[PDB]
Amino acid sequence: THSEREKRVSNAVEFLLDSRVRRTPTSSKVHFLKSKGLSAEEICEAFTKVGQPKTLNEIKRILS
Numbered sequence: 001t002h003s004e005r006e007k008r009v010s011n012a013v014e015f016l017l018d019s020r021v022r023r024t025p026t027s028s029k030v031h032f033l034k035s036k037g038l039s040a041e042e043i044c045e046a047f048t049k050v051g052q053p054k055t056l057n058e059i060k061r062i063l064s
């Protein structure tokens with residue numbers, strides 16, 4: 001069964017794949033994901049898993 005970390009990342013992946021979401025800016029999505037309890041590293045992992053890679057620095061800059 002999945003760890004809580006795995007559940008967060010999986011939920012994020014399914015989110016980032018939605019067609020409406022894909023049209024929403026990166027910054028809004030990153031703030032959203034942080035509101036669901038994802039760390040910057042977990043957010044960065046989800047973006048890579050869907051083939052929309054972002055640097056960790058980019059995600060950190062949004063969250064700062």
Ligand SMILES: COc1ccc(CN2CCc3c(c(C(=O)N[C@H](CC(=O)O)c4ccccc4)nn3CCO)C2)c2ccccc12
Pocket residue numbers: 008011012014015018020021024028029032033036
């Ligand atoms: C920041 O921009 C937005 C946030 C939310 C929504 C609403 N839903 C879009 C589709 C969607 C959502 C969610 C979602 O919020 N899932 C959970 C919520 C929960 O269980 O608390 C979740 C997502 C990410 C991380 C953790 C949990 N999942 N999916 C895909 C499967 O339907 C949320 C948006 C819809 C259109 C465009 C932008 C959206």
